[PDB]
Every structure is written in structure tokens, then in C-alpha cells.
Design a protein around this motif. Structure first.
Motif, mmCIF file in Angstrom:
data_model
loop_
_atom_site.group_PDB
_atom_site.id
_atom_site.type_symbol
_atom_site.label_atom_id
_atom_site.label_comp_id
_atom_site.label_asym_id
_atom_site.label_seq_id
_atom_site.Cartn_x
_atom_site.Cartn_y
_atom_site.Cartn_z
ATOM 1 N N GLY A 27 -31.962 -8.289 -86.645
ATOM 2 C CA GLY A 27 -33.327 -8.493 -86.193
ATOM 3 C C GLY A 27 -34.284 -7.458 -86.750
ATOM 4 O O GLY A 27 -35.235 -7.796 -87.455
ATOM 5 N N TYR A 28 -34.034 -6.192 -86.432
ATOM 6 C CA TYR A 28 -34.881 -5.103 -86.905
ATOM 7 C C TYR A 28 -34.701 -4.885 -88.403
ATOM 8 O O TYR A 28 -33.586 -4.961 -88.920
ATOM 9 N N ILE A 29 -35.806 -4.625 -89.096
ATOM 10 C CA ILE A 29 -35.777 -4.405 -90.531
ATOM 11 C C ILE A 29 -35.836 -2.914 -90.869
ATOM 12 O O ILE A 29 -36.913 -2.317 -90.874
ATOM 13 N N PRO A 30 -34.679 -2.288 -91.154
ATOM 14 C CA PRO A 30 -34.614 -0.866 -91.489
ATOM 15 C C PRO A 30 -34.895 -0.603 -92.965
ATOM 16 O O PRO A 30 -34.215 -1.139 -93.841
ATOM 17 N N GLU A 31 -35.900 0.223 -93.237
ATOM 18 C CA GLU A 31 -36.269 0.552 -94.600
ATOM 19 C C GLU A 31 -35.241 1.481 -95.233
ATOM 20 O O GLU A 31 -35.400 2.701 -95.228
ATOM 21 N N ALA A 32 -34.184 0.890 -95.777
ATOM 22 C CA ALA A 32 -33.123 1.657 -96.416
ATOM 23 C C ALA A 32 -33.602 2.273 -97.729
ATOM 24 O O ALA A 32 -34.233 1.600 -98.543
#
Length: 27
Positions: free
Chosen positions: A1-6
């Protein structure tokens, strides 16, 4: 769900067909 800026640097997005798509390293 959450979009982590890798933190990446081997992928690049181009805007193809009006959409964002990332390039590729090996064929």
C-alpha cells in the motif's frame, strides 16, 4: 500500500505511451 522512496540509481523512468516506465540494465 505505502510507497517507500527506495534509494536507487540503476533504474530510470521515461514517459512512454503517456506512462512512466523505467529503463533496464541487462537485455
Amino acid at each position: 500500500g505505502y510507497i517507500p522512496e527506495a534509494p536507487r540509481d540503476g533504474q530510470a523512468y521515461v514517459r512512454k505511451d503517456g506512462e512512466w516506465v523505467l529503463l533496464s540494465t541487462f537485455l
